[PDB]
Amino acid sequence: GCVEVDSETEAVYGMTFKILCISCKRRSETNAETFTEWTFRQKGTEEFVKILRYENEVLQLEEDERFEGRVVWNGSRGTKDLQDLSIFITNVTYNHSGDYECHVYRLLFFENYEHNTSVVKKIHIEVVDKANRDMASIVSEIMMYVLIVVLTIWLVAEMIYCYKKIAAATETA
Amino acid sequence: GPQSFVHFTKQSLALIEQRIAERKSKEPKPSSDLEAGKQLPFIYGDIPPGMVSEPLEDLDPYYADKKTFIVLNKGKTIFRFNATPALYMLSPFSPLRRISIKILVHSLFSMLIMCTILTNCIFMTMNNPPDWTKNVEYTFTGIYTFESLVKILARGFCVGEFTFLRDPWNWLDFVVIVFAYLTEFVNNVSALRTFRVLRALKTISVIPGLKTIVGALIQSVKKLSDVMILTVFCLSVFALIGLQLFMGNLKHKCFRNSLENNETLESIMNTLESEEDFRKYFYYLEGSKDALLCGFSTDSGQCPEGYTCVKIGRNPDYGYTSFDTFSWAFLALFRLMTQDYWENLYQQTLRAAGKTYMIFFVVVIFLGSFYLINLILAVVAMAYEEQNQANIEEAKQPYWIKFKKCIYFIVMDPFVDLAITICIVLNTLFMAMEHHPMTEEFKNVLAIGNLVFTGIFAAEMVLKLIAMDPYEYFQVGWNIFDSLIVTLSLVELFLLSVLRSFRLLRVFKLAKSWPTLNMLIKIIGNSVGALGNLTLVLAIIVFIFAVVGMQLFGKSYKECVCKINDDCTLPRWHMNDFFHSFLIVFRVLCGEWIETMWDCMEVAGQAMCLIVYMMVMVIGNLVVLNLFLALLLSSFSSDNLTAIEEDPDANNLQIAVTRIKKGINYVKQTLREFILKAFGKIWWNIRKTCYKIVEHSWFESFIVLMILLSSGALAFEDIYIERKKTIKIILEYADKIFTYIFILEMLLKWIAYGYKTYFTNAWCWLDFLIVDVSLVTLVANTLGYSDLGPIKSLRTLRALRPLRALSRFEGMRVVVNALIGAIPSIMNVLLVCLIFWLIFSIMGVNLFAGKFYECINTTDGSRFPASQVPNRSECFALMNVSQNVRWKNLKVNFDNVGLGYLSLLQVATFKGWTIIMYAAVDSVNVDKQPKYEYSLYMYIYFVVFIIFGSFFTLNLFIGVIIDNFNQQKKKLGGQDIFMTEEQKKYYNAMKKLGSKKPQKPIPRPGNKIQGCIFDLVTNQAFDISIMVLICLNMVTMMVEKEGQSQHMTEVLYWINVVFIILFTGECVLKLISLRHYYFTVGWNIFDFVVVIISIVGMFLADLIETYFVSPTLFRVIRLARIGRILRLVKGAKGIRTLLFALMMSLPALFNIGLLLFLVMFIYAIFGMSNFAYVKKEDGINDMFNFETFGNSMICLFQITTSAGWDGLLAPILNSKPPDCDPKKVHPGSSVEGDCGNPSVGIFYFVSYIIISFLVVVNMYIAVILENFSVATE
Ligand SMILES: CC(C)CCC[C@@H](C)[C@H]1CC[C@H]2[C@@H]3CC=C4C[C@@H](OC(=O)CCC(=O)O)CC[C@]4(C)[C@H]3CC[C@]12C
Ligand SMILES: *[C@@H]1O[C@H](CO)[C@@H](O[C@@H]2O[C@H](CO)[C@@H](O)[C@H](O)[C@H]2NC(C)=O)[C@H](O)[C@H]1NC(C)=O
Ligand SMILES: *[C@@H]1O[C@H](CO)[C@@H](O)[C@H](O)[C@H]1NC(C)=O
Ligand SMILES: *[C@@H]1O[C@H](CO)[C@@H](O)[C@H](O)[C@H]1NC(C)=O
Ligand SMILES: *[C@@H]1O[C@H](CO)[C@@H](O)[C@H](O)[C@H]1NC(C)=O
Ligand SMILES: *[C@@H]1O[C@H](CO)[C@@H](O)[C@H](O)[C@H]1NC(C)=O
Ligand SMILES: *[C@@H]1O[C@H](CO)[C@@H](O)[C@H](O)[C@H]1NC(C)=O
């Protein structure tokens, strides 16, 4: 169905990056008309500036140098009901580092009722020179080798002790 | 002896009166052979012509002193009368009484009465009789008056010892007569007519051998007294638990947040009448009659944005589905026990309260639905077995000649009969190739094949008719059947669709060589043979129930039709006419009554429909169960006695087999002859070391722990795995570690055991296969082949890791051993059932090939009428004119034989059968729009299939399974086959508990006050007073209801407090006169623990309700009140014995439950892997899917009972658009498409239901054996 996953917080300079914003309706069978607005605040600044707005299968970009010609819509396509409101940045630049808010406005159409609802989702993205490995992969791998080496020492050791004992029995025979 | 015969004269009466006078002045059981309504003994010989149907003396000496006489008819049946004049007017010697007695004992009299009753029963089936039937009813009344006039003046009326009113069955006739006359003279049709239905019950007193069956049924009922008491007690306890847990939960609804004109929920709720207006304020799913249920917890249903959950309005299902009061809770618990539509209630309760309450349904099902039904079944089986034992115990105590003879020589058993068997098999296989999208050439070849098969069969029949004499042809029943089939085939050739399917009956000819099919034929023959009376009684009961229901609710279904149908037309199931009433009765007997309950209570009131439906269920199920056990045991033991050898006459198939054995072997030997004419001490210690390591207990514990961890790691891989990156990475590395560990285990086992020993073990083979699949997957992942199609399909096989736990635990091992031992006997019956279901499937394909297509309006799913768009072409024009139109066909149908098999499986389980039934009865033709009940009488096909392919098929299966398990038990010395050795020791220790002799009595104490208290408590008066106090407490708990005022709450709280104080006082008094001997009795320990639990629970509940906000935990800890009423089983010995039998059955049930849980875990992992992204429709929705391990287990527990498996299977069957979307994009995941795989889903569900059936049957048998052992010892 629909799963709300968090966007990755790490971006590598000079490559591409996708900023996830997924907002799933509480009930899937309902119908709605959704449009999104993205706001970005750079480091060293305390004001949030709108950068894009997507509505009715057409993307509108604000006139900002940091995002002109390097943002495309990766998100729901073919529908006015959008549950993935994500964007992709084609060449990452240091200016892109900062905190981005996705505001989703959904009108839910019901019998005799329309409810207009809003969700704001916040992502912090840091541009970095080179990709950095997760602590969990680094910690897990070291633990898998330590468990595999520890088990092998217990089997080799137990066998050496048992063989010494069995050898005595044959001599005793 | 035979000469003891003389006419009854006045002198004999004078002598009898003189003997009576002598006996009075002075101031033994009659021969059962000479009892009334019995055959005259053969020792008396024939009857001289002049005394038949004449009054004679009493052959029974007992009555020789009293004034009685016997009359004999031409059938040597004796009848006992009284010599006292009838109403003091008619003497025995009077000619009028002579004529009355002549009429009374005669075959024509009984024939006339039977014909009258049958004709009246036929006339009872007309719901709107014409104006000409009044005279016929008057004639029936006159005939009944005539017959009741003969008897009344032949035996008198309540004046004699052998008079009219003493017969209990004569009271029915008198009531019929008086009711008819009184209602005629006084003049609702509903009641008076429904009362005239009693004339149908007179069939019992006129058809011979039916009174004995009715008496046997009453006797079988009488032995069920304790079981019904335990059933009512358990149902009431579970109803109280459900009332506590789910009080008012089914009233939660999604109420909108924004209300205009300053409107409130209270003000809204009193101005709402129609569902169209209710839909404007509450959230309804499309096409739903009830509002959507919600809950306040995180595991319950979720309201849409803009709606909030609130408890306001009525309950679902016309307000009949609730736990609001004790009555509705009891009805719901009875519904759960009978498993009628219980999945809907289960789903509603989970949505309204949360998924964590599946424990309540698991416990309730496993106890109320399984064990109580087992007890009823076992007790009725004991009753029938005892009746059979008593019955068998008391019973024992020219040129033409030349040529026609040449033809007889042509008839040779080894070849001709084998050829005919081959031809029958080939004809069945040929006729099984029909399908709907079938070209004209295929039709032509099928037609010519059927024609040639019919021709050769007719040639065989003619050749046999001219070989032996036509009189010689007709004694053999098989020959008569073959000739009848040939004439039917010829009649069809000269000319319906049903007649073409009468050729499939030739398959039963294989029973001469197939022993197991002959068992099924024997069961079917006994159904109308030795047990014909029971079947006739069942048919009479069904007819009476159908006509009674039609009379009671026929007009109500029509006047109040708009209450149960928006269109204001009669629904699919109703009682307006006889046929639909009979269909309702049959459906109830199948086990579906609540949905018709709702409509009946809506149209005609709760009380009448409830009473009628409960009576129908009780009587019908009792009769059906008695018939089932009768057939089962008769064909089990009485039919099979090895009287004759295996085919005493050399079977033609056996002769052919012997001829083949000679010929093939001789030819091969001659060919061989022609071919010959033409032409390490240290290594041994290592093996010793690895053996010591492998067999140690620490190795076993470590490997079991690793298996458990590896199996549990699979449950985490759900659709939310992308929110748990760390857990996902840990799982990948852990899987690598497990692969390494199991490689090491495999190497150690290879070294210790050797290749021969390791590969001669089945468990070792299974472990080797699993580890090989894991190693292949790991090496493919390492070598970069991680996205290949075959590799991705191989990766789903990690759901078979839990299979490694079978060899590690003894309970699953022994259960698996029993199952594998049973499999060979299961296979043959499975083949017989496949042949039978194939015959039915071919018939269904012939009847309904391609007729289930319809033109629907897609946006609302409503079939278009037949006045417009009656054809496929018109539907095509409508689609290309209007967008929301589709000419679709049912997913499960009778298009071919495989789809017919799936349809028959759905019908036999009674899950999804209604849609197929509606499509069949609406079917018209190929490329024709269906019309409402156009082929109305196609329901007979499904009824006949249900009877033959469920009742008799299950009978045969269980009969062979009993033999298989009895042989398994006998082979190993009679020990239980589902229990381990330690379990056997604990079972023996438990057995010693239930047979303890009376223990040493507790001595009195020396103190005077303590002695008085001692003689007080040990009195039985104390025990009975405590029992009635517990009953009053139970009633007080029953009084509670949803919406009660605060005053009632306070009153009930104070009453419960008083009861708690009284029980505490009882415990304190017991603690003084018993001293430390109080704890020497287990029941007293239980009483102490329940008193403590009650006090602590009520304190904690008060504390939480006063100084905390947690209703859920409040109810959970207030459930401790149930402990007090559980003490009622102490006073009742029978239910205590049944509970002891359950405790005995617990270990084997634990082992089988472990096996079932492992199978469920494997299937849950497979469902998570496969059907996680299937479209959410039919039985799949937001809360019941295969997205999560919890959801998968919720779904699988539901279908372990077969409940709602069709609704889960249906969404998976979508494979192509517009059914599904192959390129559907799911946010948060890379899986594309919501389509399902029909083959995988079908195999999944069919295999799971088959395995569940086998496991449930195993549990049934284990419980029944434990029940028989307890009662008969
Ligand atoms: C031993 C028991 C279990 C089965 C004995 C009977 C079989 C020989 C039957 C049962 C299912 C039958 C099949 C069911 C469905 C089909 C598909 C059918 O073709 C279609 O449905 C598509 C036609 C088209 O659109 O052109 C051709 C016959 C066939 C293979 C049937 C061939 C004969 C089968 C295998
Ligand atoms: C199928 O049903 C239609 C129902 O009318 C038959 O009638 C034809 O209907 C179409 C459009 O409604 C007209 O254009 C034709 O002139 C109608 N013909 C007749 C004879 O009424 C139509 O004949 C049927 N077709 C088949 C294949 O039976
Ligand atoms: C982005 O553009 C810069 C030039 O400004 C180029 O050097 C860099 O390689 C580009 N990165 C990608 C991924 O296209
Ligand atoms: C996102 O945009 C990139 C570049 O335009 C494109 O290659 C990628 O496929 C898009 N993904 C989605 C799902 O829109
Ligand atoms: C990014 O924005 C910063 C703002 O200080 C600017 O200095 C830098 O040149 C920009 N780089 C590009 C080309 O995106
Ligand atoms: C409340 O309802 C009354 C109905 O007459 C209306 O007159 C009033 O304006 C409402 N007030 C509010 C606060 O909406
Ligand atoms: C049916 O539908 C089309 C429009 O989609 C219509 O123009 C024409 O009459 C029909 N076309 C075909 C192919 O039958």
Author numbering:
A (entry chain B): 20 to 192
B (entry chain A): 8 to 34, 47 to 206, 209 to 418, 728 to 825, 831 to 1014, 1175 to 1768
Paper text:
Nav1.7, encoded by SCN9A and primarily localized to the dorsal root ganglion neurons, has been explored as a prominent target for pain management. Here we report high-resolution cryo-EM structures of human Nav1.7 treated with drugs and lead compounds with representative chemical backbones at resolutions of 2.6-3.2 Å.
We show that vinpocetine, a synthetic derivative of a vinca alkaloid, and hardwickiic acid, a natural product with antinociceptive effect, bind to the III-IV fenestration, while vixotrigine, an analgesic candidate, penetrates the IV-I fenestration of the pore domain. Although no density for lidocaine is found around this site, densities for VPC and HDA were resolved. A battery of hydrophobic residues on S6III and S6IV are engaged in accommodating VPC or HDA, including Thr1404 on P1III, Trp1332 on S5III, Thr1448, Leu1449, and Phe1452 on S6III, and Ser1697, Ile1744 and Phe1748 in repeat IV. Notably, the binding pose for VPC, which extends deeper into the central cavity, only partially overlaps with that of HDA in the III–IV fenestration.
